Symmetry: C2
Subunit: 93 residues, 2 copies
């Protein structure tokens, strides 16, 4: 009975200089998330395992599969588009 209805952000334009910086942002988001998992005892494992706290994402961002890096860049871009949609200006200083 749950149907996700995400905001339409397809018409939200961000500055090109920011989109160029997608990887940089996604990388940091990843570092933050990786450090939190690691702090709770999580370690790298090629297969995800909740009982032994194994996760394959616990590698440097650059070593993540491309498809995953792509999802991360998109998640970061969509977050920022949400901000702009909520009525905030975003400009290179």
């Amino acid at each position: 009975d749950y149907i996700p209805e995400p905001m339409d952000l397809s018409l939200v334009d961000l500055p090109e200089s920011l989109i160029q910086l997608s990887e940089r942002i996604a990388e940091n988001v990843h570092e933050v998330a990786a450090k939190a998992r690691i702090d709770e005892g999580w370690t790298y494992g090629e297969k995800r395992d909740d009982i032994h706290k194994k996760h394959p994402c616990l590698v440097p961002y650059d070593e993540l599969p491309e498809e995953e890096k792509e999802a991360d860049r998109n998640t970061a871009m969509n977050t920022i588009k949400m901000v702009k949609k909520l009525g905030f200006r975003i400009e290179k200083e």
Copy 2:
């Protein structure tokens, strides 16, 4: 050999009007991620199951455990702080 080293963002100040909207943003990020999982045939299950594509996050944002909403708001805020750290102004129009 991997040690996550996230940017120090503790001195990045975002507008209070934006932080007040953390939940809205985190909710939308959740809707997008949930639609993507559901698109690949994932369904709700009380325990996470990769073989059967069960995930407990596939519920309305509001029904998520408070700690997860908290993580989500923080993840959105850190993303936006990274933008400001990279040299972008963020202001309510």
